[PDB]
């Protein structure tokens, strides 16, 4: 089934691109880290006031 398997693989990769390029939430785990750090710094700066 090598040809079938290669075709399914190639298709699956194309699906990954379609998901990643259109679903912003797909990378929420990394964006959340950035957001937490940004909040920590914004909080720290605002405290100066």
């Amino acid at each position: 089934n090598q040809k079938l398997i290669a075709n399914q693989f190639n298709s699956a990769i194309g699906k990954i691109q379609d998901s990643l390029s259109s679903t912003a939430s797909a990378l929420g785990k990394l964006q959340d880290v950035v957001n937490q750090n940004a909040q920590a710094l914004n909080t720290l700066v605002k405290q100066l006031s």
Binding site: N42, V45, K46, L48, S49
Partner: protein, 50 residues
């Protein structure tokens, strides 16, 4: 209503110790395009600094 203080010239694009109407700090004074309203003398940052 300001005290008996003699003003000096303003020097731009260099680190200076400034005093504007009693407001002091250290920094570089540069030209800007900030649209202050006729009644606004000072602008502020997130930290409430000038």
């Amino acid at each position: 209503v300001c005290g008996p203080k003699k003003s000096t010239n303003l020097v731009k694009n260099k680190c200076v110790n400034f005093n504007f109407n009693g407001l002091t700090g250290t920094g570089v004074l540069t030209e800007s395009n900030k649209k202050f309203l006729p009644f606004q003398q000072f602008g502020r940052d997130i930290a409430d600094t000038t």
